Write an enzyme that holds these catalytic residues in place. Structure first.
Site, short mmCIF file in Angstrom:
data_model
loop_
_atom_site.label_atom_id
_atom_site.label_comp_id
_atom_site.label_asym_id
_atom_site.label_seq_id
_atom_site.Cartn_x
_atom_site.Cartn_y
_atom_site.Cartn_z
N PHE A 1 94.73 0.64 -38.03
CA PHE A 1 96.13 0.76 -37.65
C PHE A 1 96.30 2.01 -36.47
CE2 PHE A 1 100.57 2.63 -37.98
CZ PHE A 1 101.37 1.38 -37.53
N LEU B 1 94.59 0.78 -33.42
CA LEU B 1 95.50 -0.11 -32.54
C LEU B 1 96.78 0.77 -31.86
CD1 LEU B 1 98.33 -0.64 -34.31
CD2 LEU B 1 96.78 -2.26 -35.46
N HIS B 2 97.16 1.91 -32.88
CA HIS B 2 98.00 2.84 -31.78
C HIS B 2 97.41 3.35 -30.78
CE1 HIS B 2 100.12 6.86 -31.63
NE2 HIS B 2 101.03 6.22 -32.06
N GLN B 3 96.33 3.95 -30.80
CA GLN B 3 95.42 4.46 -29.53
C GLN B 3 95.29 3.39 -28.71
OE1 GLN B 3 94.68 7.91 -31.21
NE2 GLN B 3 95.31 8.36 -29.03
#
EC number: 3.1.-.-
Length: 187
Positions: free
Chosen positions: A25, A28-30
């Site tokens: 997570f 995917l945020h980065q």
RNA sequence: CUAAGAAAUUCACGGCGGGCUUGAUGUCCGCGUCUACCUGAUUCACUGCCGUAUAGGCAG
């Protein structure tokens, strides 16, 4: 928004799936911060509300161009040993829609005491009497523990799935994939 | 329907004077404690901001 990509968690002989979920997570945020855009929706296909379990499967919702932009980003390196990556298939047409929202909490009274010190210039005992220690907010919601590059403090982010609707309107999406008014299909 | 059923022990009180326990003493030879381990499970419920707000949201 018509497409989706499904990520399954391979069982891991060294790690429980919760910290693997947190790591992916954060990745995917980065990836979404680097890529940009406000049309990326998250989903938990096997979210259990009985014990607030995150689940062992992940579904990310985006358009075809957004999905190929995400998979073109090299964030996927270093994490293939624990996940599955399917195909950007079109979501089923008869699917109920639900929303995802990040529900934060004021679990620490001393943060708000410091805040009111910066807002009303009150003393220590004034904030202690005004704010008791029992105002901590306990949430029975699934969560992920992450630390940020901007601020190294480890923050807990709760994810809650909204009620099932019959239709969805246009809305935005945050950097975490959480909806600020949008919806994701359920199937 | 119980070896069933019943019940006031209690008033008062000076224990103390005295005393040398001391003499002597070799504990001791010998000894393989090994082998094999993920502390970590979401175990940092944290920092800041909008709001008078403890009511309630938002930011990485």
């Amino acid at each position: 928004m018509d497409h989706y990509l499904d990520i399954r968690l391979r069982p891991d002989p060294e790690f429980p799936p919760a910290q693997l979920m947190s790591v992916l997570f954060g990745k995917l945020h980065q990836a979404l911060v680097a890529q940009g855009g406000d049309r990326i929706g998250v989903s938990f296909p096997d979210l259990d509300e009985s014990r607030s379990r995150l689940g062992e499967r992940l579904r990310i919702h985006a358009s075809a161009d957004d999905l190929r932009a995400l998979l073109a980003r090299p964030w996927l390196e270093g994490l293939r040993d624990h996940l599955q990556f399917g195909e950007p298939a079109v979501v089923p047409h008869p699917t109920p829609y639900r929303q995802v929202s990040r529900v934060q909490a004021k679990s620490n009274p001393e943060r708000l005491r410091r805040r009111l010190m910066r807002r009303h210039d009150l003393s220590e005992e004034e904030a202690r009497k005004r704010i008791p220690d029992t105002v901590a907010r306990a949430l029975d919601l699934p969560f992920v523990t992450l630390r940020s590059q901007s601020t190294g403090q480890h923050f807990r982010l709760f994810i809650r799935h909204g009620p099932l609707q019959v239709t969805a309107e246009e809305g935005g999406f945050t950097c975490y994939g959480l909806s600020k008014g949008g919806f994701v299909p359920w199937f």
